Ligand binder design. Structure first.
Ligand SMILES: [Ca+2]
Ligand SMILES: [Ca+2]
Ligand SMILES: [Ca+2]
Ligand SMILES: [Zn+2]
Ligand SMILES: [Zn+2]
Length: 158
């Protein structure tokens, strides 16, 4: 599968969910990128204008790709693997209620998973792994990447 062939990667937050404080969206997304830069040679920088590698979008229903959202529940988000244009982009379903905590759907935890896809990871069959296909809340303040996820990403980078 495709991988980024460079170490400096940019992201841009296209728009913000009204579910959360602006600064909390920024922080959740920043921390999610950090999870992966911790275990690879990758560096992530937020840009406010122009073409980023990874565009972060909040949208509902049909939103201009082959991955229409399905209302509250079900599919929470999706992302494209490394590549030009839409490649790398991560989309979050606005019909979910995004939060900083255990209520609603945790943005940070969801973003860690989707960014995994943005970097070229597939799914894991291990329920402990963040790349498990289905969402589950774990304490965000003590979150640690599982051994399986580390193995997965280190097969692609570093
Ligand atoms: Ca949904
Ligand atoms: Ca892109
Ligand atoms: Ca929402
Ligand atoms: Zn989409
Ligand atoms: Zn997934």
């Amino acid at each position: 599968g495709p991988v980024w062939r460079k170490h400096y990667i940019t992201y841009r937050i296209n728009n913000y969910t009204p579910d959360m404080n602006r600064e909390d969206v920024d922080y959740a997304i920043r921390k999610a990128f950090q999870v992966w830069s911790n275990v690879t040679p990758l560096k992530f920088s937020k840009i406010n204008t122009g073409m980023a590698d990874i565009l972060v979008v909040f949208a509902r229903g049909a939103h201009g790709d082959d991955h229409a959202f399905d209302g509250k529940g079900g599919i929470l988000a999706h992302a494209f693997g490394p590549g030009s244009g839409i490649g790398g982009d991560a989309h979050f379903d606005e019909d979910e209620f995004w939060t900083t905590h255990s209520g609603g759907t945790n943005l940070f935890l969801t973003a860690v998973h989707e960014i995994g896809h943005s970097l070229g990871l597939g799914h894991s069959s291990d329920p402990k792994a963040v790349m498990f296909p289905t969402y589950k809340y774990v304490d965000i303040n003590t979150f640690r990447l599982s051994a399986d996820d580390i193995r997965g990403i280190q097969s692609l980078y570093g």
